[PDB]
Design brief:
- 12% of the residues lie in helices and 40% in strands.
- The chain is built from one helix and seven strands, in the order βαββββββ.
- Strands 1, 2, 3, 4, 5, 6 and 7 form a seven-stranded mixed β-sheet that branches.
- A hairpin with a 2-residue loop joins β4 (72-80) and β5.
- The protein is globular, with a radius of gyration of 13 Å.
- The relative contact order is 0.34.
- The PDB classes it as viral protein.
- Keywords: SARS-CoV-2, fragment screen, Nsp1, KIT library, viral protein.
- The assembly is monomeric.
Length: 113
């Protein structure tokens, strides 16, 4: 399928134990996609002071369209030293590995895979 319905655990930035996916734009997009498939991916909602507490390169989920079955359609965009790789809509948050942190909420998305 080109799209997959996922429910992403929303984590508080100060709870996150693994604060990014790796060391290059290509690796973080790769790793993010693998963790999304494996159900081991969390979402941090971006506000003032969140991104400097996480590791670059960043992987964002961004709204790709204006929401089947409650699931917002999203795609992945990476960012490193102020340059983004991908072009998409509004940020829903920054993806991180999930290693058992307790979420505050779930975000239903339809991921372009």
């Amino acid at each position: 399928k080109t799209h997959v319905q996922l429910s992403l655990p929303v984590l508080q930035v100060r709870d996150v134990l693994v604060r990014g996916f790796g060391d290059s734009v290509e690796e973080v997009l790769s790793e993010a996609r693998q963790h999304l498939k494996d159900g081991t991916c969390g979402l941090v909602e971006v506000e003032k002071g969140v991104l400097p507490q996480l590791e670059q390169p960043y992987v964002f989920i961004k709204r790709s369209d204006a929401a089947p079955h409650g699931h917002v359609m999203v795609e992945l965009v990476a960012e490193l030293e102020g340059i983004q790789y991908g072009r998409s809509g509004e940020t829903l948050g920054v993806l991180v590995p999930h290693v058992g942190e307790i979420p505050v909420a779930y975000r239903k998305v339809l991921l372009r895979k």
